[PDB]
Structures are given as C-alpha cells and as structure tokens.
Design a protein around this ligand. Structure first.
Ligand code: HEM
Length: 181
C-alpha cells in the first residue's frame, strides 16, 4: 500500500535492492511514522528524490530508473483499475482515450482536481500522435507507461520523444508507431 505510485515502486525496490534499502532511504527521507494508502495524497515531488536515491544505489541515471518505474506503474495499475482497462480493446483506443475515459473514470472514483493536459490522435500509417504537458516534468514516466501498456496487449511500439519542455517548447511530443507500420 502506501500511495499507489509509491506502492508499485516499493515493490520494484523490494525486488532490486530489497525491502531493507527501501526502508533505509525512505526512513531517511520519507516519514517513518506517517503512513499513507493507495488512495491518499501522493506528492510526486518526493518521488523524484526517491527514484534518485535508489538510482544512486543501482548506479543508474535517474532518467533510466524513472523511465522503468513508468512501465511497472502501468502493469500493477491494470490490476487496480482493471475494470477501467477492460473498457479498452486495444493499445490505440487507450492512447486516444487516456484523459478522456481513464481520466473521467478516475474523477468518478474520487474528487481530485484536474489531470495533466493530454491530447491523442490517430494517423493513417498505423501511428498515434500523443501530446503530454505537465509542470511535474514526469514526461519520462509517460514513456514508461505507454511502452508498458503496449506490451501488456502483446504489442511492440516505439515512442519518439523529440519535443520535450526540457527545452522550453510549448509542451512534450511523443510520436508513437506500431511495429511493421
Ligand atoms: C498508458 C496510460 C496512462 C498514461 C500514459 C498515463 C500517464 C500519466 C502521467 C505521465 C501522469 C502525470 C504525472 C505528472 O504530471 O507528474 C499520470 C498521473 C496519474 N495517473 Fe496516469 N496514465 C495512464 C493510465 C492511468 C491509469 C492506469 C490510471 C487510472 C486508474 C491512472 C492514474 C493516474 C494517477 C492517479 C495519477 C497521479 C496524479 C497525481 O498524483 O498528480 N493513469 N499518469
């Protein structure tokens, strides 16, 4: 438990460095007294430092770790909001439906303010254009999630994240393409 985001990640660390390290950087950073749930607040702001700590332990760049957590995050989630997934018959529908159906669905589950700005579209050459913009700059995760989704549905895609606010552009551009286009 403890934050759905931190929950899936907690498990991932239990597999890599183990629960012992998870508690070491957590108790050092996050509170040992305060306990959250897979439905309570989940300030990602703290995550960044967490994915960095563990990254220092795996001796991997923070960008490669966060990316991974994104993939894992889609997996475990498909278990939580599974009913919400069984609404989409394919990877594509999910990409053009993200904020729309999934977001809408989330709102029904809980109040919540507003989800990041996400816009998807379909292309003729079996491609899907996805636009992701958020001040959290968690874009790296975005890719991880998308890549994971496809895999779940036995699909092999490629995401070209050329435009990235990291530069200062209007937003992030994630071009997707289906294998054997
Ligand atoms: C491939 C599909 C999905 C994509 C591409 C996606 C992408 C993202 C991204 C990148 C963020 C914003 C992080 C940020 O701006 O800091 C996010 C947050 C979130 N997503 Fe998804 N998501 C997907 C599916 C879902 C699913 C499985 C659920 C619904 C059950 C969901 C639940 C959430 C929640 C609750 C947050 C946290 C919001 C917050 O803490 O501010 N997403 N997602």
């Amino acid at each position: 438990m403890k934050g759905i985001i931190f929950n899936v990640l907690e498990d991932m660390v239990v597999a890599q460095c183990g629960m012992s390290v998870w508690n070491e950087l957590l108790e050092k950073h996050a509170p040992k007294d305060r306990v959250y749930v897979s439905a309570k607040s989940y300030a990602e702001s703290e995550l960044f430092s967490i994915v960095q700590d563990v990254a220092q332990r795996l001796n991997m760049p923070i960008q490669d770790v966060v990316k991974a957590f994104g993939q894992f995050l889609f997996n475990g989630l498909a278990s939580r909001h599974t009913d919400v997934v069984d609404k989409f018959d394919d990877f594509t529908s999910l990409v053009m439906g993200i904020h729309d159906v999934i977001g809408l669905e989330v709102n029904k589950l809980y109040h919540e303010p507003s989800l990041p700005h996400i816009n998807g579209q379909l292309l003729p050459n079996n491609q899907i254009a996805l636009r992701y913009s958020s001040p959290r700059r968690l874009c790296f995760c975005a890719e991880g999630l998308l890549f994971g989704a496809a895999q779940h549905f036995q699909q092999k895609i490629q995401i070209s994240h050329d435009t990235c606010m990291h530069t200062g552009a209007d937003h992030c551009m994630l071009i997707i393409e289906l294998q054997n286009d």
